[PDB]
Symmetry: C2
Subunit: 399 residues, 2 copies
């Protein structure tokens, strides 16, 4: 059923577009200045703030870039927003940029300080997908969350409490949690946790276990390709009428759109452009915890690890100066595309059950058997391509 799902989400994409265009028309920005991922970000956040303000806005004068600090009627923003969505709320829409930000943050930063202070192992990076994503996120907003993400929450919710209506949350938060797991025991053990009203260290220690079980017996976590507002604004302005022509966040749509996007970015004096583009590209698909090998394979070019990456962050801090600042054109095109999946793959004390399953598991264990990559011409999911990694690679752990 390509009617609702493909076209209803198109309608949510149209809104973001239209809005971005309106909002650019207010700031009286130029074309080059509306394609500046920097300005786009600021706008996106102005809105999510107002629906739950001012921000940094960069301008282009003969030669150099001028940063403007501006403020807008928090309500005016809310007004312009609905105008674009037919006076609707389109929570989906706000939630969408709510994720684009997430996926950018899960790739720009490593959230160790928080994991440890929670009592999670810092090496549990690949499980913190969407830890930045405000709880306000929608129902299809949490589905993108990693197993580890959920645990950091419950553990804090529990840690302060064990240190009224709050209950329905906890059970559900677990049901979701449990719905991440895709194996008997995994599933069953979550229940054994959800049994206690005042779950103390008993649980505190057990979920942490299950957290680690997912490192081997992963769960189902959806990935959503959420592009910057400018990309959708520009597309809408170019005539693309997505609600009519349909759009996806896990199909070929997002890659294809990024195959023509003209996004620019501010870039510090010593930073590497190629390295900058990489970053953004990984935020456009929630590939911050993907196997670098595959990311590079699909990308078309080296996908260098975080450490070796030359950049501190896409947003420009108030600290920096504009004199020594310039801007490059972001390389967001990719070689092939792939169905962003949700599945994690698979081959007494319920712990034992898992520990026993954990064991038989080898890192070499092939997942998504038969699934492959698609050419950018292959609109339909017709012919798949299987990658062979016998190759001089460059790692697998972005972090």
């Amino acid at each position: 059923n390509a009617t609702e799902i493909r076209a209803s989400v198109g309608k949510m994409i149209d809104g973001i577009g239209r809005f971005y265009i309106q909002m650019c028309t207010e700031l009286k920005l130029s074309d080059y200045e509306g394609r500046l991922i920097q300005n786009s970000l600021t706008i996106e956040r102005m809105v999510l703030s107002a629906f739950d303000t001012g921000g940094p806005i960069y301008r282009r004068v003969d030669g150099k870039w001028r940063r403007e600090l501006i403020l807008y009627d928090k309500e005016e923003i809310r007004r312009i927003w609905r105008q674009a969505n037919n006076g609707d709320d389109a929570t989906a829409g706000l939630t969408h940029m709510m994720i684009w930000h997430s996926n950018l943050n899960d790739a720009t930063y490593q959230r160790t300080r928080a994991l440890v202070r929670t009592g999670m192992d810092p090496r549990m990076c690949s499980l913190m997908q969407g830890s930045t994503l405000p709880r306000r996120s929608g129902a299809a907003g949490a589905a993108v969350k990693g197993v580890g993400t959920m645990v950091m929450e419950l553990i804090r919710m529990i840690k302060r409490g064990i240190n009224r209506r709050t209950r329905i949350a906890y059970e559900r938060m677990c049901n979701i949690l449990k719905g991440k797991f895709q194996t008997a025991a995994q599933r069953t053990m979550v229940d054994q946790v959800r049994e206690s009203r005042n779950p103390g260290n008993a649980e505190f220690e057990d979920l942490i276990f299950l957290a680690r079980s997912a490192l081997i017996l992963r769960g189902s976590v959806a990935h959503k390709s959420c592009l910057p507002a400018c990309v959708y604004g520009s597309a809408v302005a170019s005539g693309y009428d997505f609600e009519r022509e349909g759009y996806s966040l896990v199909g070929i749509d997002p890659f294809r759109l990024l195959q023509n996007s003209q996004v620019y970015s501010l870039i510090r004096p010593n930073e590497n452009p190629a390295h900058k583009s990489q970053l953004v590209w990984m935020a456009c698909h929630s590939a911050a915890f993907e196997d670098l090998r595959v990311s590079s394979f699909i990308r078309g070019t080296k996908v260098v690890p975080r450490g070796k990456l030359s950049t501190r962050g896409v947003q420009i801090a108030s600290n920096e100066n504009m004199e020594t600042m310039e801007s490059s054109t972001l390389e967001l095109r990719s070689r092939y595309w792939a169905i962003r999946t949700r599945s994690g793959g698979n081959t007494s004390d319920m712990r034992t059950e898992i520990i026993r399953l954990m064991e038989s598991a080898r890192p070499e264990d092939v997942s998504f058997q038969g699934r492959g990559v698609f050419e950018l011409s292959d609109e339909k999911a017709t012919s798949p391509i299987v990658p062979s990694f016998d190759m001089s690679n460059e790692g697998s752990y972005f972090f």
Copy 2:
């Protein structure tokens, strides 16, 4: 703020109108045959069923009335509906006819069999407002519910249980419950009830108490003037564009609309027309438990009690025959109008507190001090009129 509230509800009224018109255009009914509250009902239910089918449709041939038994694509109905509401769901709209039905049922029938089988006193009629109203009803759907209505639910929910997620319901169902009460103890005692996870006869017996407290220290229950689909259909067709001109369910709007409505009804051989109109009129304003004195005052004419009412029900059963069947024009006009209110008025063991309050209360205790009735010219709430009941009345208890 007469923008959203007055115009957004207008938009929900337009939908019902437009839809009714479309649906009449399918059945290829006539003008007289679209004004037949009978047919209107059937249509309204066809829809609520499909959004959660066929029905009885009466036709007019030379002289006599022909009943057609027809069926429609449950989805077709859902299709035509959205078409009218801009492809929206307009739950409000369905919920609206969800109430019109309610308010008609709370006046056509007395629901004793159910109260007693629940363990409520049959004399608690005036507290069962909206007992027929499906739980599917919306949030502004339950606000119309009487205190007694809520109790019959919890008591059954509790009775079968005490005989998972079901919990958040119970607490909320009480919070609503509690939000009906408008006095300290009343409010506090509800909490003392909401304390038990498995509330047994302890609660079973206590709420029943609180049920009876409302007979004296009433709560806040909203009343919504919800007219039959035909009335809105006809109005929409006559040009009235409510979303633009605004509409209310507790103002002068509904009375004014009914001041020009041409609604017809099927009427059995021995039934009294004047008596029939009365019924419908009381369902148009949720006046089934109002003081007959006031109902007649505002009505303009005698509002006779249920027993002395000549009619069995507005819908025609499959049992009856058409040969001995005819139809009259319903008198729905009223003398004055009044702001349909929500307020119930006011002047160790928390029981004691109430019982002590209960006591000081006299039936003669004046409520809505200063509030009056408005002429049908008095569009604004400008000049109020105070009724003096020194008069040869005809009772106060419709039941």
